[PDB]
C-alpha cells in the first residue's frame, strides 16, 4: 500500500516504534484499562471475546495494513471488551496510546482521514455482509467471505485462483455446519480443495450470489478489485 506506508513514516518521524508479535500473543486485551490504537502494519490478527464459560469467539479478522482501536478516540473508554490476537506466525504493529493519537492525528489531516476511512471501510463492510445474508442466507455469507479472501490473497494458477493463505491459517478460518455447506458448494465446482489450499474456478458464481460484498470491495479497494476483474 501507499497511504499506509506514509502513515508508517509519519508515525516514525514522530517517534512511534513498531512492536513485533508472534502467534497467540495479544496486542491488547479486554482487561487492560488503557485503551490503544493499533496500526497493524504487517501480519494477520483477530478480534476475540471471552464469554462466562471462557470460550473464545472470533468476531473479525484484520490484515496489515489496518487500524484497530480498543477505545473511542475521545472517551478513551472501551468500545467493547475485546482482545486483539496474532494468528500469523509473526506480526508487526505500532501500538499508540489513545491519548497521544488525538494529538498526532490533529497535526496532520491526511493521516487523520486515513484512520477515518478505515472505520468507514469497516462500517460499509458490515452493512454489505448483512445485506448479502439478507438476500442469500448462509450461501451469500460464505460466498462473500470466499470472494474477499480470493481478492486479497488470490494468485491465478492453472487450476484456479489459489487463496495463498498458510495451511494452519485457513484451517482455523474454516460448530461445523459451514464446512458441510462448503461440500455442497464444492460439488457444483465453484471451489476445489487442492494442494492444501482452496482454488476458485467460478468467481462469477461468487459475485452473483454475494453481490454487495463484491460492490463493497470495488468501492473500498478498487485497485485490488481490479486485478481479478
Amino acid at each position: 500500500n501507499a497511504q499506509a506506508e506514509e502513515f508508517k513514516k509519519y508515525l516514525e518521524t514522530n517517534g512511534i516504534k513498531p512492536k513485533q508479535f508472534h502467534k497467540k500473543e495479544l496486542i491488547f486485551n479486554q482487561w487492560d484499562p488503557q485503551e490503544y490504537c493499533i496500526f497493524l502494519y504487517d501480519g494477520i490478527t483477530k478480534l476475540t471475546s471471552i464469554s462466562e464459560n471462557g470460550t473464545i469467539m472470533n468476531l473479525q479478522y484484520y490484515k496489515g495494513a489496518f487500524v484497530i482501536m480498543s477505545g473511542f478516540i475521545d472517551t478513551e473508554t472501551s468500545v467493547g471488551y475485546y482482545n486483539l490476537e496474532v494468528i500469523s506466525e509473526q506480526a508487526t504493529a505500532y501500538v499508540i496510546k489513545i491519548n497521544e493519537l488525538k494529538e498526532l492525528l490533529s497535526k496532520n489531516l491526511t493521516h487523520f482521514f486515513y484512520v477515518f476511512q478505515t472505520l468507514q471501510k469497516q462500517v460499509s463492510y458490515s452493512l454489505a455482509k448483512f445485506n448479502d445474508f439478507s438476500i442469500n442466507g448462509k450461501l451469500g455469507s460464505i460466498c462473500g467471505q470466499l470472494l474477499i479472501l480470493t481478492y486479497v490473497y488470490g494468485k491465478e494458477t492453472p487450476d484456479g485462483i489459489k487463496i495463498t493463505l498458510d495451511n494452519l491459517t485457513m484451517q482455523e478460518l474454516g460448530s461445523s455446519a459451514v464446512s458441510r455447506i462448503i461440500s455442497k458448494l464444492k460439488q457444483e465446482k465453484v471451489i476445489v480443495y487442492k494442494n492444501s489450499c482452496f482454488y476458485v474456478q467460478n468467481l462469477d458464481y461468487l459475485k452473483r450470489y454475494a453481490p454487495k460484498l463484491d460492490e463493497w470491495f470495488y468501492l473500498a479497494c478498487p485497485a485490488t478489485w481490479g486485478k481479478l476483474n
Binding site: 472470533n58 473479525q60 479478522y61 484484520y62 489496518f66 467471505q145 474477499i148 479472501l149 486479497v152 485490488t224
Partner: peptide
C-alpha cells in the same frame, strides 16, 4: 484489509 478486513475479512471474515
Amino acid at each position: 484489509e478486513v475479512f471474515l
